Amino acid sequence: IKGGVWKNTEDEILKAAIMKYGKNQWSRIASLLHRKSAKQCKARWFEWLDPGIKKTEWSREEDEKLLHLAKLMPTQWRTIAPIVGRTSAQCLERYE
Amino acid sequence: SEQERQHNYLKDGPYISAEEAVAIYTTTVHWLESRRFSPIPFPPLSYK
Amino acid sequence: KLEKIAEKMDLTLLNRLLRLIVDHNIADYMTSKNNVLINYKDMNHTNS
């Protein structure tokens, strides 16, 4: 079985595993985390846990750019995410 | 090559510009109207 | 043979065409699903 919410210890073992082996070994990193293994470690790192992921409030120009880009693109959200660099999930929940 | 091809589309890409995009779009609307097609609805809650 | 048809499908327009028939809520699902991120081994890129 895999999935469900992420504890602390799984994030911290994930960071620590990312320190020794990490940036693309993730099958090997899953060996340390049961229950969260191959794809989910990588997805936790890049979507939430990466440094520079900019978890702060949405300013004026970021909200401007996001609504401007939603009108320009339609639904392209993985492309929209780099420009606003607030990523994919952060764009979508903010937009909605 | 695909990363180049995708990256170049953001930079150069919107090829089907104004005239072609509206031309084919309007062509489909005239066609589908002439069929008297109906848009496929979102599937009802208890669709049999 | 029309060759390129899959690539050049340029999702901005496709949503409008799909928007017509496949009543818009599903149309955003279909075109947003094409956008997803392609992984091989250690190569990652977004299918814009």
Binding site: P74 | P39 | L20
Partner: peptide, 29 residues
């Protein structure tokens, strides 16, 4: 921001051209 939110909702929310109806307003910038 809020004036632009209304504007694009009238783009995204609409039913399709095959379901004739009043064109909801749009705003310039």
């Amino acid at each position: 921001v809020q004036l632009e939110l209304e504007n694009l909702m009238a783009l995204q929310n609409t039913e399709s051209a095959l379901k004739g109806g009043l064109n909801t307003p749009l705003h310039e910038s």
